[PDB]
Ligand binder design. Structure first.
Ligand SMILES: O=C(O)c1cc2sccc2[nH]1
Ligand SMILES: [Mg+2]
Ligand SMILES: [Mg+2]
Length: 711
């Protein structure tokens, strides 16, 4: 064996070395006592962890039988509801309360705007993310399909000025909508000056100020001839870079080189569904990146420093130039062999994540010879089921704080709302974290995986595409905003919404995603720094703080709508529609699995069945597999169907990775591909996985590949 014995634990050496040599130095935490903390916290909390997982299995078991004992269709929702209360699945709502969480940064309590999520195992992507707090609107507009390439404005090897002018025009118009001049348009501006503390803008036959001078917030250079001008609207910053000597500024009517938008206000470094990390070596690669981010010395190429400005009244000030970080730890399910037992039992990965990522974050609270200036650590806990599992997270963070010698309530929690048992008890869930909570958040994929698994025995479900528009999910989206607002989230915590997955479809993002801030969402997920810039446009257009005031007190969702199961209408599909959906789901699984098992990639630009590039995480494996498994259970399709579909889609996936040197085809040797067998196992063993979770099968298969590669 290759482990370091500490109490009842056998720590993997790679881990042991990393914590001692890299992580602990600077934290003034005694390496001896730290490892004692670990062995003690693990031993003390592991049974509670295991009891929760057991309880998930008990409830599901009762719901399984219940559905199998229904003669009368359609489902009596009154009985169904009372059964859930009986078995303690549906708990009574607590009285109104207001969260009490202190020491939270302004990016979270106050500022509405984009929030970026990125695989922590990718230093470059993670580097770009932390620096994505500020980004160029011009590069984003020119680089993407927001500005059409319709004849004249196509992207070429060389810079296209027809295109550049439309980019300019777009930004000129954005200025008009966001920070309006009393008279005239930014489009005709010829210069910018600052006299007596007010911003004057040069116009052809006049000059004006802002309609609200308040929106002027600073500048750089000399007041007579500024190198930039800093505007604020809706708490978000806009910078107009003025440089008549630049290529763009030369042919610009006011000498403007660019417009810079405060984009990714916060960022989530992810240890969960966007990364593949199945052993001790994978975990330390992850932890090491998190360390470099927190010490501030990650480099491939560095982390930006803050920005300097002159106050409107000729003073001096500063704005942060990094995107405030969260970290997402893994949920309650998995164990990982980075630490094993004396009998060989793996130690729970969630517990490990709280200890290590929390240890590491201490560096981010002190001068990089920097992060939460108010003294907090931000962890996003995924895949929780119900308030009891939330209280368990508190106690974990409590103990870890003691081990690390941190003040209590230092380790804040963002509660993901992505499991059905959490949704319908959301108010209780927040109350259980009332003094630590900084964040709620909804999303399609995981929540829909759980929806389908929980009602597996009820009957055939609707196609994946139909789920977005089903009653349960609309109620869920609204119910989350309400429970957040009612618990006092406005001004105190983020209410968030899900990811835009179509990375090349930015015009479409720019028209569609605006509904999220309009839905009252203080923040929402974007897959890149570019998209974070474009999504920033939405918070300039929507006054989220006002939308939230207006929603306050409304109960827009009822428990009946939440509990409305997405059953399919009897004989709803034509045989070709069934085939299209099977082929679609098998392609989604195959497309994501092959990269996961063969290459340890947890998120990437995966072409779908129609060659649209989706940037999904592992949750897309849960929904897709649970759905085919559902359809299997109820005889919507056969096993001959599933196999035939997988065998057709694998060559297709193969070609979609034609440009990848490292790629191993799955065709034609299907049963010899670990990736192919994994895709197949997820589907055929799907009904039996706890809550449809894909980690057990996936992790095992990636570890199987690692071993064949070890030869
Ligand atoms: O589809 C999603 O929910 C998703 C895609 C990516 S990439 C990093 C997180 C994340 N989440
Ligand atoms: Mg998820
Ligand atoms: Mg407004």
């Amino acid at each position: 064996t290759d482990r370091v014995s500490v109490g009842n634990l056998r720590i993997a050496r790679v881990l042991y070395d990393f914590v001692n040599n890299e992580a602990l130095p600077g934290t003034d935490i005694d390496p001896d006592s730290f490892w004692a903390g670990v062995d003690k916290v693990v031993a003390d909390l592991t049974p509670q962890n295991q009891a929760l997982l057991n309880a998930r299995d008990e409830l599901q078991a009762q719901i399984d039988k219940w559905h199998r004992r229904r003669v009368i269709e359609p489902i009596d929702m009154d009985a169904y509801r009372q059964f859930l209360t009986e078995i303690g699945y549906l708990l009574p709502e607590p009285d109104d309360f207001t969260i009490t969480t202190s020491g939270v940064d302004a990016e979270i309590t106050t500022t509405a705007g984009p929030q970026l999520v990125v695989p922590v195992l990718n230093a470059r992507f993670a580097l770009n993310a932390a620096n994505a707090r500020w980004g160029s609107l011009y590069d984003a507009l020119y680089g993407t399909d927001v500005i059409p390439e319709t004849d004249g404005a196509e992207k070429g090897p060389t810079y296209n000025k027809v295109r550049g002018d439309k980019v300019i025009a777009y930004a000129r118009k954005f200025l008009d909508d966001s920070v309006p001049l009393s008279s005239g348009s930014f489009g005709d501006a010829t210069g910018f000056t600052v006299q007596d503390g007010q911003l004057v803008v040069a116009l052809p036959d006049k000059s004006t100020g802002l309609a609200n001078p308040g929106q002027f917030a600073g500048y750089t250079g000399a007041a007579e001839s500024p190198t930039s001008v800093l505007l604020i609207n809706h708490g978000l910053h806009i910078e107009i870079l003025i440089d008549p000597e630049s290529q763009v500024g030369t042919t610009d009517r006011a000498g403007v080189k660019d417009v810079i938008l405060e984009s990714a206000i916060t960022t989530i470094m992810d240890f969960e569904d966007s990364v593949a990390a199945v052993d001790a070596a994978d975990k330390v690669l992850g932890y090491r990146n998190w360390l470099g981010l927190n010490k501030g010395d990650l480099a491939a190429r560095v982390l930006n420093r803050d920005r300097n400005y002159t106050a409107p009244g000729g003073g001096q000030f500063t704005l942060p130039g990094r995107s405030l970080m969260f970290v997402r730890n893994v949920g309650h399910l998995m164990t990982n062999d980075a630490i094993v037992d004396t009998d060989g039992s793996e130690v729970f990965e969630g517990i490990m994540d709280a200890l290590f990522t929390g240890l590491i974050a201490i560096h981010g609270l002190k001068a990089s010879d920097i992060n939460s200036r108010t003294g907090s650590i931000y962890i996003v806990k995924p895949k929780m089921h119900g308030p009891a599992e939330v209280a368990f997270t508190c106690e974990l963070f409590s103990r870890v704080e003691d081990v690390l010698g941190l003040p209590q309530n230092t380790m804040k929690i963002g509660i993901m709302d992505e499991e059905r048992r959490t949704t319908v008890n959301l108010k209780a869930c927040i109350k259980a974290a009332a003094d630590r909570v900084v964040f709620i958040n909804t999303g399609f994929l995981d929540r829909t995986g759980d929806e389908i698994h929980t009602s597996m025995e009820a009957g055939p479900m609707v196609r994946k595409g139909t789920m977005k528009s089903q009653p349960w999910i609309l109620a869920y989206e609204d119910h989350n905003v309400d429970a957040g607002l009612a618990a006092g989230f406005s001004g105190r915590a983020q209410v968030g919404k899900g990811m835009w997955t179509m990375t090349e479809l930015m015009a479409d993002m720019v028209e569609t995603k605006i509904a999220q801030p309009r839905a009252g969402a203080s923040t929402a997920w974007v897959p890149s720094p570019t998209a974070a810039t474009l999504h920033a446009l939405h918070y300039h257009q929507v006054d989220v703080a006002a939308v939230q005031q207006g929603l306050a007190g409304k109960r827009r969702a009822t428990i009946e709508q939440l509990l409305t199961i997405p059953l399919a209408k009897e004989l709803a599909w034509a045989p070709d529609e069934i085939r299209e959906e099977v082929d679609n789901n098998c392609q989604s699984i195959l497309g994501y699995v092959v990269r996961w098992v063969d290459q340890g990639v947890g998120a990437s630009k995966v072409p779908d069945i129609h060659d649209v590039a989706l940037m999904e995480d592992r949750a897309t494996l849960r929904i897709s597999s649970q759905l085919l498994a559902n359809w299997l259970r109820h005889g919507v399709i056969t096993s001959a169907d599933v196999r035939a579909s997988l065998e057709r889609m694998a060559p297709l996936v193969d070609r979609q990775n034609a440009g990848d040197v490292a790629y191993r085809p799955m065709a034609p040797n299907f049963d010899d591909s670990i990736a192919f067998l994994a895709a197949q196992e997820l589907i055929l063993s799907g009904a039996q996985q706890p809550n449809g979770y894909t980690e057990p099968i996936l992790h095992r298969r990636r570890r199987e590949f690692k071993a064949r590669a070890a030869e």
